[PDB]
Amino acid sequence: VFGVTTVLTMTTLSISARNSLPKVAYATAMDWFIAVCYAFVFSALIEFATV
Amino acid sequence: MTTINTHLRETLPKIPYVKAIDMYLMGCFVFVFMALLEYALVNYIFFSQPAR
Numbered sequence: 310v311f312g313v314t315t316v317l318t319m320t321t322l323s324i325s326a327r328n329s330l331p332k333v334a335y336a337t338a339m340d341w342f343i344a345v346c347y348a349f350v351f352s353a354l355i356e357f358a359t360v
Numbered sequence: 361m362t363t364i365n366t367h368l369r370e371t372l373p374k375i376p377y378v379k380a381i382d383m384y385l386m387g388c389f390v391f392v393f394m395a396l397l398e399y400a401l402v403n404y405i406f407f408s409q410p411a412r
Contacts (some may be wrong), residue, residue: 320364324364
């Protein structure tokens with residue numbers, strides 16, 4: 310449940326952040342921060358699987 | 361997946377045919393559906409042939 314809810318809310322946050330600014334091909338700093346945090350969640354799940 | 365679909369839906373107009381993005385999202389929906397049905401199948405026959 311931790312995993313599913315974290316991933317779901319993270320996807321919702323990622324969608325929400327993009328609407329604040331116009332459609333741009335490049336990636337903003339906000340996008341990099343969100344991607345890194347999403348990677349941290351994914352890494353937590355990977356460490357779960359390893360253990 | 362439904363959240364992604366609705367957010368995509370609002371931006372676009374109401375066109376009859378099927379778009380490429382719609383084809384991809386439908387494919388992903390089918391993948392998730394088949395995963396859930398596969399779990400249901402596993403749970404259905406487990407008592408008789410758990411090794412299966």
